[PDB]
Amino acid sequence: AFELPNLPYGFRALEPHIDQQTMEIHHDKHHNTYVTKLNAAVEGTDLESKSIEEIVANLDSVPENIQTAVRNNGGGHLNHSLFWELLTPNSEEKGTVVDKIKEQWGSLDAFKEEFANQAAARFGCGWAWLVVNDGKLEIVTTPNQDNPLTEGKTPILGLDVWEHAYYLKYQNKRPDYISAFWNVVNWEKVDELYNAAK
Amino acid sequence: AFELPNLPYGFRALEPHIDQQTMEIHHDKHHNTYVTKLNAAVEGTDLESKSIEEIVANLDSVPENIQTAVRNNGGGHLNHSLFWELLTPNSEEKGTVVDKIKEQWGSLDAFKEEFANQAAARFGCGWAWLVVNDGKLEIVTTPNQDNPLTEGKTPILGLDVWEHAYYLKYQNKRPDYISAFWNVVNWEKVDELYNAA
Numbered sequence: 001a002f003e004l005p006n007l008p009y010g011f012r013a014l015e016p017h018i019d020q021q022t023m024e025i026h027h028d029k030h031h032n033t034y035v036t037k038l039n040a041a042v043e044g045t046d047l048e049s050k051s052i053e054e055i056v057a058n059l060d061s062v063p064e065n066i067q068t069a070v071r072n073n074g075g076g077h078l079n080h081s082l083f084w085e086l087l088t089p090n091s092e093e094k095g096t097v098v099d100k101i102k103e104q105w106g107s108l109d110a111f112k113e114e115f116a117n118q119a120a121a122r123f124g125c126g127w128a129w130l131v132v133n134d135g136k137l138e139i140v141t142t143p144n145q146d147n148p149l150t151e152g153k154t155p156i157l158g159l160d161v162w163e164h165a166y167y168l169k170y171q172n173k174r175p176d177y178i179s180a181f182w183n184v185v186n187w188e189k190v191d192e193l194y195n196a197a198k
Numbered sequence: 199a200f201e202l203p204n205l206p207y208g209f210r211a212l213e214p215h216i217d218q219q220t221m222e223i224h225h226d227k228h229h230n231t232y233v234t235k236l237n238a239a240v241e242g243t244d245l246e247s248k249s250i251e252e253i254v255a256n257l258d259s260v261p262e263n264i265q266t267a268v269r270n271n272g273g274g275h276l277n278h279s280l281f282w283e284l285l286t287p288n289s290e291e292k293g294t295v296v297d298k299i300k301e302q303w304g305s306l307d308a309f310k311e312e313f314a315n316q317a318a319a320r321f322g323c324g325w326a327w328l329v330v331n332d333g334k335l336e337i338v339t340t341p342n343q344d345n346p347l348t349e350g351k352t353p354i355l356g357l358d359v360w361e362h363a364y365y366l367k368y369q370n371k372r373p374d375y376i377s378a379f380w381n382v383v384n385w386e387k388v389d390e391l392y393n394a395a
């Protein structure tokens with residue numbers, strides 16, 4: 001059975017970029033709900049013993065009776081699990097992926113602008129991703145709890161742009177949330193995901 | 199062409215069921231954005247001189263170039279235009295539609311139970327609606343800014359269950375938001391929409 005992972009830091013460690021109250025509710029309620037519903041769905045089946053990464057990567061192969069339940073709640077569990085580890089109070093804009101970004105986009109700023117444009121343009125609930133697509137870096141957004149893994153693209157950075165992730169602090173100002181995000185990116189975790197790619 | 203309508207009451211009117219901050223931002227930012235984007239999409243096209251009800255009812259016939267934009271922002275403008283009119287500080291649980299709910303569901307409570315259930319079960323962003331479908335009432339939910347008018351079902355009540363509609367006051371507790379909504383339903387507007395059905 002899947003478990004809610006502890007945050008790698010205190011609920012207020014990401015202030016003033018993400019507020020304590022959001023980290024608490026987002027982790028203890030929203031993510032916890034995804035875990036509950038995922039467990040109910042796969043309870044006493046083959047999937048119960050697989051990694052959430054392998055389940056989401058091979059969604060198309062999940063029994064049709066529960067496929068959507070696993071897509072949404074399995075997606076939720078993986079996405080938020082990645083998100084907690086991708087955030088840090090000790091963000092350093094350096095490493096393997098930062099260097100690769102500087103080469104491909106010309107600057108970290110130019111990449112941040114494209115990511116922020118894509119993230120703001122995602123109408124409704126979803127995520128903005130940096131992915132490795134066949135060795136190349138690409139920015140893509142997905143609806144709901146969908147994950148590029150399912151489409152054979154490895155995600156190495158994700159931003160949750162569901163309104164529950166930003167509304168208490170930023171209300172309608174999603175662009176301001178996206179700007180604050182850069183201050184708490186764990187580029188060490190980004191490098192880790194990139195290096196484990198394919 | 200399309201204008202942001204004024205609320206028919208003060209930002210504070212629906213307290214303590216819906217907070218003042220949310221009424222102001224939901225209307226002055228979120229709805230206003232739908233209007234801006236809608237005007238941009240239809241500018242210098244047939245749609246500029248049509249009712250929003252017409253456009254959303256005949257969405258499939260919008261040029262494919264701009265259909266998604268009109269769907270999302272035209273939808274936004276209709277759904278919020280309805281929503282502001284479907285709220286009031288002077289809610290009274292009586293009228294044509296309340297009587298018909300009592301007839302069909304056996305009690306207003308039975309209806310509220312189904313509505314709350316559907317509204318709570320809508321994964322992600324969307325709306326929960328009471329519709330007239332071929333002369334009969336039905337509860338349905340839509341994703342994003344989709345409206346049952348497009349499916350040929352007349353909406354007579356709507357609840358916004360996008361997180362921006364409830365997150366400031368209720369956060370994750372969507373069911374508490376849904377429960378509070380009953381205190382501010384404009385059943386006179388529900389009757390007006392049902393009669394014009």
Ligand SMILES: [Mn+2]
Pocket residue numbers: 026030080160162164165
């Ligand atoms: Mn989330």
Ligand SMILES: [Mn+2]
Pocket residue numbers: 224228278358360362363
């Ligand atoms: Mn809304």
